[PDB]
Amino acid sequence: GVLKIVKVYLAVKRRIQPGDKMAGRHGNKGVISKINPIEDMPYDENGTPV
Amino acid sequence: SVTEFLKPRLVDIEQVSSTHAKVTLEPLERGFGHTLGNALRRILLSSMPGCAVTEVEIDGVLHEYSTKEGVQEDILEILLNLKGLAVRVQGKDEVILTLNKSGIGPVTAADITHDGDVEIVKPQHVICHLTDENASISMRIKVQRGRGYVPASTRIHSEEDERPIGRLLVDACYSPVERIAYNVEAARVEQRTDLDKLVIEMETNGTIDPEEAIRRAATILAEQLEAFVDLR
Amino acid sequence: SVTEFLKPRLVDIEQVSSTHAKVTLEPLERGFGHTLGNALRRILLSSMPGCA
Amino acid sequence: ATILAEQLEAFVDLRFDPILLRPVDDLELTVRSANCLKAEAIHYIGDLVQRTEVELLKTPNLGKKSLTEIKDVLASRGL
Amino acid sequence: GPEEITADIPNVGEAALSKLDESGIVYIGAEVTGGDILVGKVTPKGETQLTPEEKLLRAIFGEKASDVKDSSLRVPNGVSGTVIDVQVFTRDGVEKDKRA
Amino acid sequence: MNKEILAVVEAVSNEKALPREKIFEALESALATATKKKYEQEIDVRVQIDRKSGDFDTFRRWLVVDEVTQPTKEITLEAARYEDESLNLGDYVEDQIESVTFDRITTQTAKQVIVQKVREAERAMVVDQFREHEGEIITGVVKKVNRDNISLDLGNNAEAVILREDMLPRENFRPGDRVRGVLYSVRPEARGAQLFVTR
Amino acid sequence: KPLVGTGMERAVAVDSGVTAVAKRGGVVQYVDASRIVIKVNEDEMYPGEAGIDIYNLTKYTRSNQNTCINQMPCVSLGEPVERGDVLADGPSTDLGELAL
Structure with a gap:
């Protein structure tokens, strides 16, 4: 019955955002709550933020 | 002397390296x-403010998810490498650069045809590798000046004008400062034995002079504090 | 532009009391x-300065 | 606010073309078109740009494509 | 009657057809969003097999709108991305388009 | 190529309203617009299909002036040595050949020019055959009514538009009313309001 | 790569077919993002053949879960290779080690 088929592949670049599910390798899971600014996160003596 | 405050001033610019x-x-x-120093951070x-790459154009490449014959790295990898490129633009806020290369070897940032007003901080920065002798790469790089981080999604949602197929868009990271660390230590002057001095260590990408950054930060803080001074 | 920055416009003052x-x-x-609040605080x- | 701002007083401290002199062969035009321009008594692009178009084909050894090309590159350069 | 893929689609603007090629398939590497036409398809309806009228009335006020109704595939709402690959499968005995 | 043009010229329902000469001239103008769209420059040209001879060709219109902008249509007032010009102004050439007529822009402009020519020709021969009627009383039936102008139908693809300016301040044509009305003026110059019928 | 691992990542990466593994040892005659052509060694020559083998790495192919599958070349031009070594890393693989 069908004489032609057209297939189109669409690529989407998904970035991280609040609500995405993140977790480690020890069963600890959670959801991103806030994309904090770089200047808001705590920093060590050398000034490198977490 | 409680009523009056001693005026701070810059006393030393110790340039460890091109960046630190x-x-x-x-x-x-x-x-x-502490207080002022914290604000500065x-x-x-x-x-x-800083200069960052916004748009890329490759003659033989029509979308960033494809691959080009003769280059070892992917087109997306090339865009990601170009994202970290640091350049200094003087005179205007919009520069178009041309990169032409042919032959086996890496393609360093020095291969970009400089226009005189634009300077390459890291000429040895790598972009891609040509593993074929008869392989030619021609690329147009668009660089702008701005502040903060502007994702490509913001640009595509703004949709000022339709872009022809093959104009790749990369995320813009205009911020040239990567690390700031402030320290407060004792200062000896006029036997006061109570004044302190502040040492700020800056690790940047090298396109902005630390003294200029300090001046700009102080000017921005004063401009913000002007409204508080007025208080309607 | 780049040097331009946002300035407060709705500066509202509420007097709870003679001091508050x-x-x-x-x-x-x-x-x-956050910077302005922390610095002012x-x-x-x-x-x-004051007499006590 | 006045104290904080005055603490930053010492820190704020803030508030004829080059192608024309080049020979006509630099007009990215064909060599035959360059010879046509030379035969036009115009060896430099300055004379061609300054003067209105004239003798575009009155000179010898003219071809249609070169006749189009000389004026096309003259208009495209916009010197 | 059999449906065919063609660039011409009824009552659509030129902006929608700009993304499509002459054959009737969106160009590879073209950014598309919800509502765009990736491939233009039209199905015969009501009447057909009248080619002189089709040639003569290709843009007259009758426009044979009821003769062929639009069935072009559209991007689902809320889906955005870049086209990276197009595949065409055609059964034997059917003329192959240029994209194939 | 040619067979298509004969097919589209022999399938015209209004052969009286589209004779071969005017429809082929419209096709020439459409192909000129297609060539304008094809090239990045703007050059007005003519085709001269050669209706009864065979295939078609393309020409080039110079429009001799002293300007330099848009070089494709610029020629000096005295450049007439070779190429058989021998004139001061108005020299045209047969230079450009092999113009593609199978493209989106070409097909779109061809069809648009064809339908525009259909409309212009039908207006021309509904204004030519009803121009001598000026000063005489001719009836009609209205079809569309608006706040600025209304439309009337006469017969044989005849449409008239009457404006508020043509209305007298006191006398008006009520919607749905048909009556004999004198033909005050006939204006072939304006495509709209072709038959200025009033009382 | 995982900073803290269990040492089993290499086995999982090699056993899975996501990454390209050199069937025979030799040198990388031609390295490219699309294909890798390797000239095998004289010791491992099969009789009556040219002596080169070509691996065509899959690029940006949709998976079952609508996820991109990308194979990136690992070796460089002129680098000797041996049987069992990883020539191109598959998705979520770094230097022949699985990295999720």
Whole structure:
């Protein structure tokens, strides 16, 4: 019955955002709550933020 | 002398390397060395103008998810490498650069045809590798000046004009300051034995002078504090 | 442009009493409010001259 | 606010073309078109740009494509 | 009657057809969003097999709108991305388009 | 190529309203617009299909002036040595050949020019055959009514538009009313309001 | 790569077919993002053949869960290779080690 088929592949670049599910390798899971600014996160003596 | 405050001033710019640097401010009274210093950090990591790559154009490439014959790395890898490129633009806020290369080997940032007003901080920065002798790469790089981080999604939603197929869009990271660390230590002057001095260590990408960054941060802080001074 | 920055416009002053007061600043650049508040709080707490 | 701003007083401290002199062969035009321009008594692009178009084909050894090309590159350069 | 893929689609603007090629398939590497036409398809309806009228009335006020109704595939709402690959499968005995 | 043009010229329902000469001239103009769209420059040209001879060709219109902008249509007032010009102004050439007529822009402009020519020709021969009727009383039936102008139908693809300016301040044509009305003026110059019928 | 691992990542990466593994040892005659052509060694020559083998790495192919599958070349031009070594890393693989 069908004489032609057209297939189109669409690529989407998904970035991280609040609500995405993140977790480690020890069963600890959670959801991103806030994309904090770089200047808001705590920093060590050398000034490198977490 | 409680009514009047001693005026701080810059006393030393210790340039460790092309990127790492240290700035000394003296003198500062009691907790000021913390407070002001903290503000500077919170101004330096978010409100520092800088030049970043916005758009890329490759003659033989029509979308970033494809691959080009003769190059070892992917087109997306090339865009990601170009994202970290640091350049200094003087005179205007919009520069188009041309990169032409042919032959086996890496393609360093020095291969970009400089226009005189635009300077390449890291000529040895790698972009891609041509593993074929008869392989030619021609690329047009668009660089702009701005502040903060502007994702490509913001640009595509703005949709000022339709772009022809083959004009790749990359995320813009205009901030040229990467690390800031402030320290407060004792200062000896006029036997006061109570004033403090502030040492700010800045690790940047090298396109902005640390003294200029400090001046801009102070100007921004004063402009913000002007409204509080007025108080309607 | 690039040098331009947002300035507060809705500076509202509410007088709860002769001493208690609330000041509302609207709007500010993202993160600038924390800097201004912390700096003003520290200056008022540990630097205001006065007789005691 | 006045104290904080005055603490930053010492820190704020803030508030004829080159192608024309080049020979006509630099007009990215064909060599035959360059010879046509030379035969036009115009050896430099300055004379061609300054003067209105004239003798575009009155000179010898003219071809249609070169006749189009000389004026096309003259208009495209916009010197 | 059999449906065919063609660039011409009834009552659509030129902006919608700009993304499509002459054959009737969106160009590879073209950014598309919800509502765009990736491939233009039209199905015969009501009447057909009248080619002189089709040639003569290709843009007259009758426009043979009821003769062929639009069935072009559209991007689902809320889906955005870049086209990276197009595949065409055609049964034997059917003329192959240029994209194939 | 040619067979298509004979097919589209022999399938015209209004052969009286589209004779071969005017429809082929419209096709020439459409192909000129297609060539304008094809090239990045703007050059007005003519085709001269050669209706009864065979295939078609393309020409080039110079429009001799002293300007330099848009070089494709610029020629000096005295450049007439070779190429058989021998004139001061108005010299045209047969230079450009092999113009593609199978493209989106070409097909779109061809069809648009064809339908526009259909409309212009039908207006021309509904204004030519009803121009001598000026000063005489001719009836009609209205079809569309608006706040600025209304439309009337006469017969044989005849449409008239009457404006508020043509209305007298006191006398008006009520919607749905048909009556004999004198033909005050006939204006072939304006495509709209072709038959200025009033009382 | 995982800073803290269990040492089993290499086995999982090699056993899975996501990454390209050199069937025979030799040198990388031609390295490219699309294909890798390797000239095998004289010791491992099969009789009556040219002596080169070509691996065509899959690029940006949709998976079952609508996820991109990308194979990136690992070796460089002129680098000797041996049987069992990883020539191109598959998705979520770094230097022949699985990295999720």
